[PDB]
């Protein structure tokens, strides 16, 4: 009744003006859906709200009933802040404004985020090693440490002009392991398991190391990154090794957890070993021990297996003791020569190993059999330097595709000309053929020419359309059919070593792979004799000789590649921009922290919450 | 008198820590950057210094020699004829406890070939180090070796991966080496308890002199001089005498006239001046000569490395606008 509107009274007054209707509704409730007054008023009010097109409000009500939750856990704020690359500045501007306008602290202050960072970065969680690692500190609260690992910087000491930052490999593994705790537990439950099981778990980890390239703005600054990827986690349950986790996209840049960043050249051997060898020490030390780590309030035990496979060819040779030129031993998996592999194309066993390269290097140094340089070079099969990183004898699918394509490119050059007609080495005319080729690729395709070929160019180049388009500069009509068959066989082959699982994804291509390989080889021997006689490229060799053996051994080749976007550079750049321009040291420190957060499965859950 | 010298084909292989050795007129280069390539598997080179230009030609090894890795700060010396090398820093940052012996085994027209023989040791075997000093002594018939330490990595019990590359001057023991027999024995000096490195060693007859270098546990570059003596049935004694330099290189312009060219004076001050050692029989004193005509580049530099040919001339290196990593000089007296 006038003059007091219902929404301004006391709840006594309200309940009294209303009670007339309350008895009506309470009666109604007890009849249809007794005796939940709450549910009835809910349905009513909601209808009344959507009736008047007040949807934002109705949604907020529906949300409130279900327990959410208007603000945001610091963890989610940090997730947002990273995956959108906000500076601390930017974020703070947004925080304070949303706070001010809404009165609610929907985003969290920066110190909150700072904490979420501490929880998610190496050095937070407690763990212990059994037996404790040789030459590694058992001190558990270690996060970021200096890449130089204490290297002498006296003036008369060997010049160190490089900056580097890293994690302790064990600490980093703990962090990575805790980050994906929920993934492990859910894996267990999905395999029908008490998720309390202590283990032991076997964690298969893929190592990889790459040259970032140039990371500057207008002197160039070269950078190098050692990183790992949790590829598989299995558990001992009776007699079988039950798989409780497998990285869905092993080649994504999202699970490539960064271990060490440095400002060096991957060609600069002394400093490279200076920086990486402490990591390797820790790695080895871990090879012979078990990790104890509490998860669901209950301790679990972990064993690791380190398959170092994500390496460029030049770098595999670097770290495994081989001379890195086309001379004369061309394969990092077998003892073949450029000529032997040019004549027997497809029959080669895998025979190299890190262990063997170690033995061989010792033999070359000591020369136990008193031999001449060539006799010795032959006994030791190319291994004249001491390996310092244990790698798996495999193929990086990325650098494989890149290199193969980089060969097809020079093929295209040598086929728009007539090399099987003219044996004349005129370097200038070579540059002319590259000229008209680069020209024509721009016109018929969407191909911007670039030096130092990457994987994108390689993607755009190895298609049948590019064959048709490169055919337009060729006078002969016979070679068109040869190149078409070459390309077709190559593309019949590529999916087998490019796939992360060809036993599932392309089981047809897998079985026919031997035969396709055969036809390819025959086609190289005859129709392309002019280049591939006495000579052959490393990757052609590897492709023909070693793919089926590697697949038999490991299930795939693709899954063990380097990240297929090579965005190490790109990322380093964005992360750099995300902070104040400080002393180059702190700059590095921050890029490492943010790169680490960037690859946390925990935050990624949040950022991918919108379609789960 | 010194002059700018240019290198050509494979300059890149030159690096701080390289060593030079002298054979009957010809100069040879050891300790390249990186492991030896196919273009020269030995890592040892003909050092062709012709008319202010350096060509680095390859060298071959004997059919029975060891193929020693490029050691980076080895203790090197001679023998009356052969060279002694021990030990150093491989290009994998490992420290060699091994002694390699450099003989020459064949001579031809333009080029020659070497013998390279590792002698292993029982002891009292010295700890794998670098920047240290090794020399030869002639007692009451006939010869022995004297090793005074430099620095090395941590003990294999106290070494942590977080401080993996942390070095420290090893014990100032004096190490006596019997080569031909193949054994070593250490001696503690009451007169010596402070470890040194990157110093300068000069010996003759049965006496060995050691000059100012650089300590670590104190960060001090002494100027003190040290004596060492030897007998024969073996024993050793020491005394002290009245410069402060680090990583100095000593040449021989004349007989018993050693020209000690620069190095470093303070942690950021390169000595830039010179000195002359008053040598004699049981009577030696540090004196000073003039100061050479350093160019503008050498003047405003922070880094000094080089080594001696033997004939008073010396080989010098300087860093370095995207043009060249190094610029080199030759210094004659
Ligand atoms: Zn092979």
Curated annotation (Swiss-Prot), chain A:
It catalyses: S-ubiquitinyl-[E2 ubiquitin-conjugating enzyme]-L-cysteine + [acceptor protein]-L-lysine = [E2 ubiquitin-conjugating enzyme]-L-cysteine + N(6)-ubiquitinyl-[acceptor protein]-L-lysine. A divalent metal cation binds at residues 210, 312, 566. Keywords: Chromatin regulator, DNA recombination, DNA-binding, Endonuclease, Hydrolase, Isopeptide bond, Metal-binding, Multifunctional enzyme, Nuclease, Nucleus, Transferase, Ubl conjugation, Ubl conjugation pathway, Zinc, Zinc-finger. One of its GO terms (molecular function) is sequence-specific DNA binding. GO terms for biological process: adaptive immune response; B cell differentiation; chromatin organization; DNA recombination; negative regulation of T cell apoptotic process; negative regulation of thymocyte apoptotic process; positive regulation of T cell differentiation; pre-B cell allelic exclusion. It comes from the Eukaryota. Changing residue 364 to A: Deficient in both nicking and hairpin formation. Disruption phenotype: Mice display a severe combined immunodeficiency phenotype. The have a small lymphoid organs that do not contain mature B and T-lymphocytes. The arrest of B- and T-cell differentiation occurs at an early stage and correlates with the inability to perform V(D)J recombination. The frequency of homologous immunoglobulin pairing is much lower. No obvious neuroanatomical or behavioral abnormalities have been observed. Disulfide bonds: none annotated. Its EC number is 3.1.-.-, 2.3.2.27. Changing residue 15 to A: Reduced hairpin activity. Changing residue 3 to A: Impairs DNA-binding and hairpin formation while maintaining some nicking activity. It is found in: Nucleus. The record marks 497 as: Essential for DNA hairpin formation, participates in base-stacking interactions near the cleavage site. Its cofactor is Mg(2+); Mn(2+). Maturing lymphoid cells and central nervous system. Residues 2-66 bind DNA. Autoubiquitinated in the presence of CDC34/UBCH3. Catalytic component of the RAG complex, a multiprotein complex that mediates the DNA cleavage phase during V(D)J recombination. V(D)J recombination assembles a diverse repertoire of immunoglobulin and T-cell receptor genes in developing B and T-lymphocytes through rearrangement of different V (variable), in some cases D (diversity), and J (joining) gene segments. In the RAG complex, RAG1 mediates the DNA-binding to the conserved recombination signal sequences (RSS) and catalyzes the DNA cleavage activities by introducing a double-strand break between the RSS and the adjacent coding segment. Belongs to the RAG1 family. Homodimer. Component of the RAG complex composed of core components RAG1 and RAG2, and associated component HMGB1 or HMGB2. Interacts with DCAF1, leading to recruitment of the CUL4A-RBX1-DDB1-DCAF1/VPRBP complex to ubiquitinate proteins and limit error-prone repair during V(D)J recombination. This is V(D)J recombination-activating protein 1. It comes from Mus musculus. The chain holds residues 392 to 1008 of 1040 of the full protein.
Swiss-Prot record, chain B:
The atypical PHD-type zinc finger recognizes and binds histone H3 trimethylated on 'Lys-4' (H3K4me3). Component of the RAG complex composed of core components RAG1 and RAG2, and associated component HMGB1 or HMGB2. Belongs to the RAG2 family. The keyword Metal-binding applies. The gene is Rag2. Its main location: nucleus. Disruption phenotype: Mice are viable but fail to produce mature B or T-lymphocytes. Very immature lymphoid cells are present in primary lymphoid organs. These cells do not rearrange their immunoglobulin or T-cell receptor loci. Double knockout with TREX1 does not show a visible phenotype. Core component of the RAG complex, a multiprotein complex that mediates the DNA cleavage phase during V(D)J recombination. V(D)J recombination assembles a diverse repertoire of immunoglobulin and T-cell receptor genes in developing B and T-lymphocytes through rearrangement of different V (variable), in some cases D (diversity), and J (joining) gene segments. It is found in: Nucleus. This is V(D)J recombination-activating protein 2.
């Amino acid at each position: 009744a006038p003059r007091q509107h219902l929404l301004s009274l006391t709840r006594r007054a309200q309940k009294h003006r209303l009670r007339e209707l309350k008895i009506q509704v309470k009666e109604f409730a007890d009849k249809e859906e007794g005796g939940d007054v709450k549910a009835v008023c809910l349905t009513l009010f909601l209808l009344a709200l959507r009736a008047r097109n007040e949807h934002r409000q109705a949604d907020e009500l529906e949300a409130i009933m279900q327990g959410r939750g208007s603000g945001l856990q610091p963890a989610v704020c940090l997730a947002i802040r990273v995956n959108t690359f906000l500076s601390c500045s930017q974020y703070h501007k947004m925080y304070r404004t949303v706070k001010a306008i809404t009165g609610r602290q929907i985003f969290q202050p920066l110190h909150a985020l700072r904490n979420a960072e501490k929880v998610l970065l190496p050095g937070y969680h407690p763990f212990e090693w059994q037996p404790p690692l040789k030459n590694v500190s058992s001190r558990t609260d270690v996060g970021i440490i200096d890449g130089l690992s204490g290297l002498a910087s006296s003036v008369d000491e060997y010049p160190v002009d490089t900056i580097a930052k890293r994690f302790r490999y064990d600490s980093a593994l703990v962090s990575a392991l805790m980050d994906m705790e929920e993934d492990i537990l859910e894996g267990m439950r999905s395999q029908d398991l008490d998720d309390y099981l202590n283990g032991p778990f076997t964690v298969v980890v893929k190592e990889s190391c790459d040259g970032m390239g140039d990371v500057s703005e207008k002197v160039p600054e070269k950078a190098v990154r050692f990183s790992f990827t949790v590829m598989r986690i299995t558990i001992e349950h009776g007699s079988q090794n039950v798989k409780v986790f497998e990285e869905p996209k092993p080649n994504s840049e999202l699970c490539c957890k960064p271990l060490c960043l440095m400002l060096a050249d991957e060609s600069d051997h002394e400093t490279l070993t200076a920086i990486l060898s402490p990591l390797i020490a820790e790695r080895e030390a871990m090879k012979s021990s078990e990790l104890t780590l509490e998860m669901g309030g209950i301790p679990r035990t972990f064993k690791f297996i380190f398959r170092g496979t994500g390496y460029d060819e030049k770098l595999v040779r670097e770290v495994e003791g081989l001379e890195a030129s086309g001379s004369v031993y061309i394969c990092t998996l077998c003892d073949t020569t450029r000529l032997e592999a040019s004549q027997n194309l497809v029959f080669h066993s895998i025979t190299r190993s890190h262990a063997e390269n170690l033995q061989r290097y010792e033999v070359w140094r000591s020369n136990p059999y008193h031999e001449s340089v060539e006799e010795l070079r032959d006994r030791v099969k190319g291994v004249s330097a001491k390996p310092f990183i244990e790698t798996v004898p495999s193929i990086d699918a990325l650098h494989c595709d890149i290199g193969n394509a980089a060969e097809f490119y020079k093929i295209f050059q040598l086929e728009i000309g007539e090399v099987y007609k003219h044996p004349n080495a005129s370097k200038e005319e070579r540059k002319r053929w590259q000229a008209t080729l680069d020209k024509h690729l721009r016109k018929r395709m969407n191909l911007k020419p670039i030096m130092r070929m990457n994987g994108n160019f390689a993607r755009k180049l190895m298609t049948q359309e590019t064959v048709d388009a490169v055919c337009e500069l060729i006078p002969s009509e016979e070679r068109h059919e040869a190149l078409r068959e070459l390309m077709d066989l190559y593309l019949k082959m590529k999916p087998v070593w490019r796939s992360s699982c060809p036993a599932k994804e392309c089981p047809e291509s897998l079985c026919q792979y031997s035969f396709n390989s055969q036809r390819f080889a025959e086609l190289l021997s005859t129709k392309f004799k002019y280049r591939y006689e006495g000579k052959i490229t490393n990757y052609f060799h590897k492709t023909l000789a070693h793919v089926p053996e590697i697949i038999e051994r490991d299930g795939s080749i693709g899954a063990w590649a380097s990240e297929g976007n090579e965005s190490g550079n790109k990322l380093f750049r964005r992360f750099r921009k995300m902070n104040a321009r400080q002393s180059k040291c702190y700059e590095m420190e921050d890029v490492l922290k943010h790169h680490w957060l960037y690859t946390s499965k925990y935050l990624q859950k949040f950022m991918n919450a919108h379609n789960a | 008198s010194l002059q700018m010298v240019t290198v050509g084909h494979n300059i890149a292989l030159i690096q701080p820590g390289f060593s030079l050795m002298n054979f009957d007129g010809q100069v040879f280069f050891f300790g390249q950057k990186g492991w030896p390539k196919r273009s020269c598997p030995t890592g040892v080179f003909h050092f062709d210094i012709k008319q202010n230009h350096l060509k680095l030609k390859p060298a071959i090894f004997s059919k029975d020699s060891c193929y020693l890795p490029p050691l980076r700060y080895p203790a090197t010396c001679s023998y009356k004829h052969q060279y002694i090398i021990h030990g150093g820093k491989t290009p994998n940052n490992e420290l060699s406890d091994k002694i390699y012996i450099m003989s020459v085994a064949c001579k031809n027209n333009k080029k020659v070939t070497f013998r390279c023989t590792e002698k292993d040791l029982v002891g009292d075997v010295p700890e794998p180090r670098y920047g240290h000093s090794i020399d030869v002594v002639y007692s009451r018939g006939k010869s022995m070796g004297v090793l005074f330490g430099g620095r090395s990595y941590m003990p294999s019990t106290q070494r942590t991966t977080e401080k993996w590359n942390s070095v420290a001057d090893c014990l100032p023991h004096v190490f006596l080496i019997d080569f031909e027999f193949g054994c070593a024995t250490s001696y503690i000096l009451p007169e010596l308890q402070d470890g040194l490195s990157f110093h300068v060693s000069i010996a003759r007859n049965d006496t060995v002199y050691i000059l100012g270098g650089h300590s670590l546990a104190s960060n001090i570059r002494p100027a003190n001089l040290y004596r060492i003596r030897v007998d024969l049935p073996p024993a050793v004694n020491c005394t002290v005498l009245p410069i402060s330099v680090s990583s100095a290189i000593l040449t021989q312009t004349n007989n018993d006239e050693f020209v000690i060219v620069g190095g470093y004076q303070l942690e950021n001050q390169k000595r830039m001046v010179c000195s002359l050692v008053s040598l004699g029989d049981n009577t030696i004193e540090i004196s000073e000569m003039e100061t050479p005509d350093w160019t503008s580049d050498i003047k405003h530099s922070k880094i000094w490395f080089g080594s001696n040919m033997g004939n008073g001339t010396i080989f010098l290196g300087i860093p370095g606008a995207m043009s060249e990593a190094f610029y080199f000089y030759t210094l004659r007296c």
